[PDB]
Amino acid sequence: VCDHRLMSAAIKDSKAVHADMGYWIESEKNETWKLARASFIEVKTCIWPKSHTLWSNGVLESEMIIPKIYGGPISQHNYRPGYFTQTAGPWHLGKLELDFDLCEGTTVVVDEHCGNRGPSLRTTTVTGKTIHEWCCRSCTLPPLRFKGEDGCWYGMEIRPVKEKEENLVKSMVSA
Amino acid sequence: VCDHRLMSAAIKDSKAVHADMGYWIESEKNETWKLARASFIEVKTCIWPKSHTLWSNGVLESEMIIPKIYGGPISQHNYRPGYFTQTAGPWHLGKLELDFDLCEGTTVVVDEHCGNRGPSLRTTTVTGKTIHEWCCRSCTLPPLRFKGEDGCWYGMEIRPVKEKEENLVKSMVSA
C-alpha cells in the first residue's frame, strides 16, 4: 500500500511541490519559503522518505503543518509562520484541501487574549449557523483553512472569539 | 553572481536531479541512492541552498563527492560509496564531466597496498603518455572519472600503481 516510487518532488523558481498518487503539496516563496496549498484525494498514513524530500534538514516535528504520520514531508516547505503541527486538523474528511484564506462569512484576528491551540473547528455549527468572529494568539494571516465538501474549517490556532459552549463541530482525529 | 531562482531540483522514480544554468547533477537508485552523472559547462563557486536541496538531512561533509564550495548540493544524493569529497579534483577545467567509468587505456585495481588519497591526476603525462596501471585502497568500481576536452582524470582515491616520476599532471587546488 506504500510505494516510494510514486512520490515526486520538484522545485523551480518560486514554486515547490511534494506530490504522490493522492497528495499534492505546494510550497511557494514570498520573502521566505512556506506552505501554500495542499490537496488530498485520500488521506494516507505513509511516511515520506527524506530521500524524496526537499529541505529535509533541521526539521522540527512541531512545526510540520502536515503531520508526518499523515504523509507530511519532513521539510521546511511543510512550515508556516505562526502555525504548528496540525495533528488535530480535520483529517477525517477524506477529500480535503489545505490553504491560507478566509472561510466565507468569517473573520480572523490576531489577539493574545484569544484561546489557545485546540482541535480544529468548523466555521458552521450543527445548525448550519456561521460563526463570524474568530481569532488566534500568535498566528499569521491569511488564516489556515481546510475545505471539505461538508463545510469549512480553521487551523488549530484559530478559535472562536465569543464561543464557550458545550456544543461545537470539531475534528475527530488526534495525532 | 549567485541567483537562487535558476536552481532546480526534481526527483521521480529512480532518478533525481539538482541542476541550474551550467550545472547538471544526476543521482540514481540501484539498491541505494548515489551520485550517477554530473556535467559542468562552467564550475561556479556559489553555495547550494538547502531549500533547493533534496535529502539535505544528516549530510556528512566528507561524503559529498562534489564540494559545497563548488556548488555540490549538501545532500546524500551527492554521495558515492568508496569515495569521499573531491576537494583536490580538477575543478579548474571549465567544461567538465564527472561519472563512474574507466579512463581509456587504463585499469583500476582495489588494493590496500596502494597510495593514499591525493590530488586528482590526469591519465596522460606531460608527454602524452598514457598511465596504464592505477589502484585505490578502499574505493569502488566503476572508478570515479572526470572528462575535459584536454584529457581524462581519476578520483583522488585512484593513484598510479608504479609511477616514480612526478611529471604527473596534477590539480593543485585545495579546499
From Swiss-Prot, chains A, B:
Glycosylation sites: 30
Organism: Dengue virus type 1 (strain Nauru/West Pac/1974) (DENV-1)
Tree of life domain: Viruses
Complex and partners: Homodimer; Homohexamer when secreted. Interacts with envelope protein E.
Cysteines engaged in disulfide bonds, as pairs: 2-46, 103-152, 114-136, 135-139
Protein name per UniProt: Non-structural protein 1
Function, in words: Involved in immune evasion, pathogenesis and viral replication. Once cleaved off the polyprotein, is targeted to three destinations: the viral replication cycle, the plasma membrane and the extracellular compartment. Essential for viral replication. Required for formation of the replication complex and recruitment of other non-structural proteins to the ER-derived membrane structures. Excreted as a hexameric lipoparticle that plays a role against host immune response. Antagonizing the complement function. Binds to the host macrophages and dendritic cells. Disrupts the host endothelial glycocalyx layer of host pulmonary microvascular endothelial cells, inducing degradation of sialic acid and shedding of heparan sulfate proteoglycans. NS1 induces expression of sialidases, heparanase, and activates cathepsin L, which activates heparanase via enzymatic cleavage. These effects are probably linked to the endothelial hyperpermeability observed in severe dengue disease.
Compartment list: Secreted; Host endoplasmic reticulum membrane
Whole-protein coverage range: 953 to 1127 of 3392
Membrane topology: Peripheral membrane protein
PTM field: N-glycosylated. The excreted form is glycosylated and this is required for efficient secretion of the protein from infected cells.
